[PDB]
From Swiss-Prot, chain B:
Name the UniProt record assigns to this protein: 5-hydroxymethyl-dUMP N-hydrolase
GO cellular component, one term: nucleus
Organismal lineage: Eukaryota, Metazoa, Chordata, Craniata, Vertebrata
Pfam family membership, one: Nuc_deoxyrib_tr
SS bond list: none
Length: 125, 127
């Protein structure tokens, strides 16, 4: 059974929290979902090393999500970023520009599509 | 000359623009500041500068994917890091940045809005 690490804004804001729950619920079909500040950081870094794939929802700007992505790229992890363009935001150049189409992927989606997007990525992975 | 890479929110919000310019100015005293095609060019140019950099300085008060990402890449390259956070903002700093501190290779310092130059001074003559 493969490991999935999911990334989503917390102190950047909990606006998309309910959408994170849907993503996590869907990911459970595709693997085990892995996901006092030092302990938080070390436990997360531990789980990040274990993960076979990293999935982030990057619509809500977040330091932690970005940092997780950064450590994940350096660890050679396959990454999927999901961004909602209809949110009115322009995605961070550093995230969007990291997309190489294989190891680092960034997918634009509509709020109601999230499940079908996840299925599409994993049915190809 | 010594190279400094500076990180600050752009697409996460420009609330702290002025404070970055203040930081950049002071950093110029301690070395060359590398940070003054599309997004792919921006990422590639920035990774190149990050690799060259001797030290990484980030203002982490405004939440930002890019800043976090840069800090993540920087840790993995083994760069010395300094994060500055402003508790006056009312925000609670991300656990992942605050928890990433080891007090030498990765420092996270709290500051008040008039202390920014004096905080930067402290780090560089202890560097
Ligand atoms: C209590 N707490 N606080 C966080 N800020 C915090 C951040 N994170 C991780 O970092 C990301 C959120 O970063 P922030 O939005 O900066 O909070 C999430 O993807 C989490 O995996 C956490 N994981 C467990 N507990 C956490 C946190
Ligand atoms: C045009 N543009 N847009 C960005 N979002 C953007 C982000 N960044 C880098 O990423 C950090 C800001 O990321 P975001 O706040 O997510 O935009 C800064 O510290 C910059 O070094 C950039 N560097 C040059 N040009 C940029 C950007």
């Amino acid at each position: 059974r493969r490991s999935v690490y999911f990334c989503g804004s917390i102190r950047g804001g909990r606006e998309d929290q309910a959408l994170y729950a849907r993503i996590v619920s869907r990911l459970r079909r595709y693997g085990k979902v892995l996901t006092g500040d030092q302990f938080i950081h070390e436990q997360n870094l531990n789980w990040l090393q274990q993960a076979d794939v990293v999935v982030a929802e990057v619509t809500q700007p977040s330091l932690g999500v970005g940092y997780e992505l950064g450590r994940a790229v350096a660890l050679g992890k396959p990454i999927l970023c999901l961004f909602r363009p209809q949110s009115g935001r322009v995605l961070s150049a550093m995230i969007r520009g990291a997309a190489d189409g294989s190891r680092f992927q960034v997918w634009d989606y509509a709020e109601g599509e999230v499940e079908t997007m996840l299925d599409r990525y994993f049915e190809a992975y």
